[PDB]
């Protein structure tokens with residue numbers, strides 16, 4: 001065990017502070033105990049229930065009030081915090097209030113490392129937005145009027161105004177107990193709260209180190225968290241992690257993809273490259289019910305099928321950066337087999353694909369992405385799939401597709417860039433004879449001489465299924481306006497117009513064409529099913545990540561979130 005003598009700890013940290021005093025005149029407002037009256041602005045010590053400055057910190061060091069180094073850091077952070085809040089951004093104090101902390105980080109993190117503390121920043125997570133319980137499908141917005149109760153239950157600005165009357169007479173749980181509460185019992189606030197990062201304490205230090213920074217998962221090492229410094233001295237090595245991505249059950253598809261990538265990296269012989277692991281972590285058969293509009297007009301009529309059976313898979317690429325697993329790519333696909341009703345027969349469609357851009361080396365990052373997406377096509381081609389489908393639609397502002405909370409400097413590409421992005425790899429696939437050719441959806445329709453909406457493939461979550469229901473309704477009210485006026489290719493037209501509107505956003509990839517396309521044995525996936533509820537679509541994993549704060553915003557947190565999700569897959573595989 002180790003304890004901090006005040007005068008030994010001063011010696012470490014005084015440089016950091018005396019450096020902060022040096023900023024001229026950035027530090028000058030911060031040098032002494034700000035007092036309302038004298039500074040002429042009456043509400044400062046009526047808003048902040050605690051007061052601080054450098055001199056107070058400076059005295060706290062010398063007198064010997066600091067047991068642990070984080071007290072010092074927190075008080076310094078508090079001084080920026082409580083000052084930022086008080087003054088408007090456009091004022092001068094605010095500007096300095098950042099320039100010092102900028103020095104502060106630069107300086108403090110290596111200084112903490114000398115002390116054996118891994119890092120040296122006060123860290124918090126993102127605004128953890130909550131969710132609805134009354135409407136069940138809805139959610140609780142951030143920085144908005146919010147309603148809640150008992151911390152466990154949250155409700156929207158529109159929720160409790162028209163559910164069970166003014167009084168809260170609806171408390172429902174799986175267990176019998178119920179509850180009736182009054183209208184005015186609720187607690188109002190605006191979601192601005194920030195939840196702070198957790199820490200873990202070592203066996204022989206008691207040191208309050210970041211969970212993320214030291215990367216300690218309770219489950220992987222239940223013996224107890226030992227930091228490396230203690231391990232180093234005792235000549236020890238943390239017992240091997242068995243919850244690694246490499247240790248996930250292998251598959252033909254996973255191995256196909258991780259070889260195509262790792263063979264490519266070996267060709268490149270780049271100095272920064274490490275080996276990649278590609279894993280299919282969910283495989284399960286499913287159905288897509290035809291929508292009510294198209295239902296009556298077609299499946300009830302006896303023209304098209306009532307449902308379409310497919311297979312949903314979830315594959316994830318990982319990389320060994322600094323001897324630590326890191327997930328940087330994820331994908332969701334829909335495989336419609338040979339025992340499937342047309343038009344959907346022998347087709348693969350990419351529901352969602354996503355990434356966090358920490359792949360090393362950066363220069364090979366995009367090329368690695370293309371190799372997966374090409375490898376997926378080649379694989380499914382070999383099984384005898386014919387047509388691949390992509391909806392090249394980037395997410396909207398603040399929306400995560402798979403990985404929760406991306407890095408701030410990960411530029412979400414504009415629809416033209418992403419369009420060109422796919423064009424590049426398909427071009428690469430075309431040259432490799434993996435892909436024969438491809439076209440946009442509109443021109444494919446023209447090529448196929450399509451005459452009715454039942455000849456257009458129907459996929460889960462696609463644009464067309466949800467627009468075809470809407471397109472029909474426009475025609476239903478079209479007659480309604482017609483009849484009222486009168487007193488004193490029906491739907492093939494509507495679609496073909498919409499396809500002309502959005503032609504480039506949708507690809508149609510022709511894996512096989514012509515002679516082979518006819519004489520084809522049935523499709524037989526050589527991989528079993530992989531039941532997993534966590535990776536059964538994107539919403540389940542985001543929820544766990546939004547709840548347990550598994551962010552991919554930084555490298556350090558992605559290394560954490562990856563480790564967490566890996567353990568959740570190795571233990572969802574335990575019944």
Ligand SMILES: CC(=O)N[C@H](CCCCNC(=O)CSCCNC(=O)CCNC(=O)[C@H](O)C(C)(C)COP(=O)(O)OP(=O)(O)OC[C@H]1O[C@@H](n2cnc3c(N)ncnc32)[C@H](O)[C@@H]1OP(=O)(O)O)C(N)=O
Pocket residue numbers: 350351352353354355356357365366369390391392393394395401410411412413414417418421
């Ligand atoms: C229903 C509905 O309507 N909508 C939806 C459902 C819709 C359909 C779902 N469809 C799909 O899933 C299939 S399309 C999936 C598109 N996926 C994403 O967008 C995920 C987020 N994007 C990414 O992960 C990446 O951009 C990735 C696509 C993997 C490509 O990364 P990259 O690294 O290969 O290239 P780069 O990103 O172009 O960047 C390449 C260079 O890009 C530069 N750059 C990127 N973006 C920009 C930019 N925007 N402006 C200027 N420069 C920019 C980037 O910084 C960089 O510089 P360098 O590499 O020199 O440092 C819903 N569910 O509601």
Ligand SMILES: CC(=O)N[C@H](CCCCNC(=O)CSCCNC(=O)CCNC(=O)[C@H](O)C(C)(C)COP(=O)(O)OP(=O)(O)OC[C@H]1O[C@@H](n2cnc3c(N)ncnc32)[C@H](O)[C@@H]1OP(=O)(O)O)C(N)=O
Pocket residue numbers: none
């Ligand atoms: C009389 C008097 O008073 N004063 C003066 C005379 C004084 C004496 C003259 N002294 C000298 O001549 C010797 S020191 C010369 C300094 N000259 C310059 O700086 C010219 C402008 N900068 C550059 O040409 C390049 O940056 C260069 C330093 C040559 C190489 O840069 P790089 O590319 O190898 O590294 P990077 O730029 O640091 O980093 C590049 C990585 O960091 C990036 N990044 C760079 N800067 C920043 C930043 N500031 N903040 C965040 N990120 C940042 C950069 O984007 C990047 O990202 P990536 O990984 O994506 O590539 C007078 N006479 O007027």
Ligand SMILES: [Zn+2]
Pocket residue numbers: 117118119120209210213214
């Ligand atoms: Zn730390």
Ligand SMILES: [Zn+2]
Pocket residue numbers: 132135138139155156157158159
């Ligand atoms: Zn609501």
Ligand SMILES: [Zn+2]
Pocket residue numbers: 202203204205206207226227228229230
């Ligand atoms: Zn220790």
Ligand SMILES: [Zn+2]
Pocket residue numbers: 270361363364
């Ligand atoms: Zn390179």
